[PDB]
Design brief:
This is part of a larger assembly, with 2 copies of chain A.
Chain A lengths: L4 H11 L5 H15 L5 H16 L6 H14 L10 H24 L1 H4 L7 E6 L3 H11 L5 E6 L6 H11 L4 E4 L13 E4 L3 E2 L5 E4 L2 H10 L4 E4 L44 H5 L4 E3 L8 E3 L2 E3 L4 H9 L2
Parallel strand pairs in A: 1-2, 1-4, 2-3, 4-7, 7-9
Antiparallel strand pairs in A: 5-6, 6-8, 9-10
Chain lengths: 316, 316
């Protein structure tokens, strides 16, 4: 009995940082599953949820795993039956677990040798902040020896842009970091925009970092296409109503109440404070009419109605 | 004699910082014209030409500056005549020159008397960073006791949002800073969008700090109105074709050359350095199709053809 699976989850991040957070969760559940010794089907699903939720609430109720955790459950729940030997249950169960992990680990690869030809000779690409998805495909393209250049949004408040350029610069790729306020000015140059994904919705929506829809309309207005890479285990069952209807933990964009009683053209270091920042949101949502093609291990999906057929296929 | 007239211009900033830059240059030109023992018409215009350019070349080749100075001349020489008394020239010049600056610095007030009713009770306004005119109208509105509350774009790289924030909060009105990456998520909550002007071109376009166009597209797509406050002496003869072709000093948005070597969620300290920040532009341009209303000392102009007719009426 581990009784602290989060550590195994955590330990995975140090045994390998090159894996996504949900991947560790599943890789941890199997360790729970394999070691768990039960006697009823209900016993498994009881601690499984009570393990997933235990794993959920530990990580600020992150969405990426919250999908993967729920999808994984509803996966093994499918072709589950108990005939004669009870041990057959666990057998069919955990064996499919590794089988799911197999596809899960190979998912972020399957998109690479599938989205790399989207880059053409001498083309110029744009990316909002770092994402493990857009990275490999570019590298799996640059590996093929193809000339191209790339801008990267600085991606406040994450600042993941400063890391993304390095990962590309290190891989022999020309970069040019650009402020979040100057993406529109860049659309004239760019031939194709490309971002990762943090969550795909029932309507084909796109929950990713805070500024995706900021540039999604630009490419829509600047007539350049829009592409986003999303692994299967990022489909979610929610369904918003706009670019705003999302549940968010901390309340956002509150105002202050000012009682009548109180007190170089580039002015660096004159910004908001950390307290001012966290009032601002963290995630974004681009309605499907603004994306022209999802990039998944299941392939490239453009209808953003078939995503539901695929989403229905993913769940029961 | 009259030399380093920039210090006159400069001492004005210490004599008064609440006035902008172009008014100071004008205040210096008339001062230059005042102590100008001249004898021929050619001498006068030869001075201010070889005077304004020295004034022009001294400050970034700023637009609002280069706007007023060039406009100042082509005003004074308009109704110019020489008859008998040569002193009439210097008389007619400074007398009319005084009338200009008199009308000039009074413009920023005249705008407030027009913009304040544009704010409704309980309205929600949006402004991209600091903007002289935007402040006064809101203040002159708040003086008249009206409930509302505004967001503020932090305005990278200028960071002028915090300055705009305080100056509003300092005048007891609610504020809430917004990083430039997440303006779109806030639009559904707004009822009006109001930004300043750093320069106005012929076609009705807008030259303001970078990210100004970043907003107007949202206001367009989010079906929210867009107003910009501009003083007359900011009009310019420039006519950019697209939303990009504008004269810019330094090279902008260049890339690197990664030869084969090897050099090596509120992450608040991995930010683009001053060098790579410089590679970003400081100005964007809002096409006239997005300006629902343009408010000036001459009034409010929505035609964006009368922008030009009033413009032609300025350049004699």
């Amino acid at each position: 009995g581990e009784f602290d699976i989060v550590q195994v989850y955590k330990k995975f991040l140090q045994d390998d940082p090159e894996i996504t957070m949900p991947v560790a969760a599943i890789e941890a559940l199997v360790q729970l599953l394999s070691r768990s010794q039960a006697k009823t089907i209900s016993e498994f699903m009881d601690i499984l949820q009570n393990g997933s939720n235990t794993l959920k609430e530990g990580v600020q109720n992150n969405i990426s795993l919250s999908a993967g955790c729920d999808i994984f459950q509803r996966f093994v729940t499918r072709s589950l039956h108990d005939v004669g030997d009870f041990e057959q249950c666990k057998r069919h169960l955990v064996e499919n677990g590794k089988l799911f992990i197999q596809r899960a680990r190979a998912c972020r690869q399957r998109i690479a040798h599938l989205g790399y030809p989207l880059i053409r000779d001498g083309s110029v690409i744009l990316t909002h902040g770092f994402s493990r998805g857009v990275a490999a495909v570019l590298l799996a393209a640059a590996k093929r020896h193809v000339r191209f250049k790339v801008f990267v949004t600085e991606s406040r408040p994450s600042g993941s842009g400063c890391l993304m350029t390095r990962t590309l610069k290190n891989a022999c790729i020309p970069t040019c970091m650009v402020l979040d306020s100057a993406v529109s000015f860049t659309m004239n140059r760019v031939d194709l925009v490309l971002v990762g994904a943090e969550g795909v919705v029932e309507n084909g929506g796109l929950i990713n970092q805070i500024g995706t829809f900021q540039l999604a309309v630009f490419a829509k207005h600047a007539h350049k296409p829009f592409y986003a890479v999303a692994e299967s285990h990022k489909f979610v069952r929610m369904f918003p109503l706009s670019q705003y209807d999302i549940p968010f933990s901390r309340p956002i964009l509150e105002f202050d109440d000012p009682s009548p009683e109180t007190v170089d053209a580039i002015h660096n270091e004159l910004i908001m404070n950390e307290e001012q920042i966290r009032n601002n949101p963290t995630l974004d949502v681009t309605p499907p009419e603004f994306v022209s093609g999802l990039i998944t291990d299941l392939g490239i999906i453009d209808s953003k109605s078939g995503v539901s057929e695929e989403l229905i296929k993913l769940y029961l």
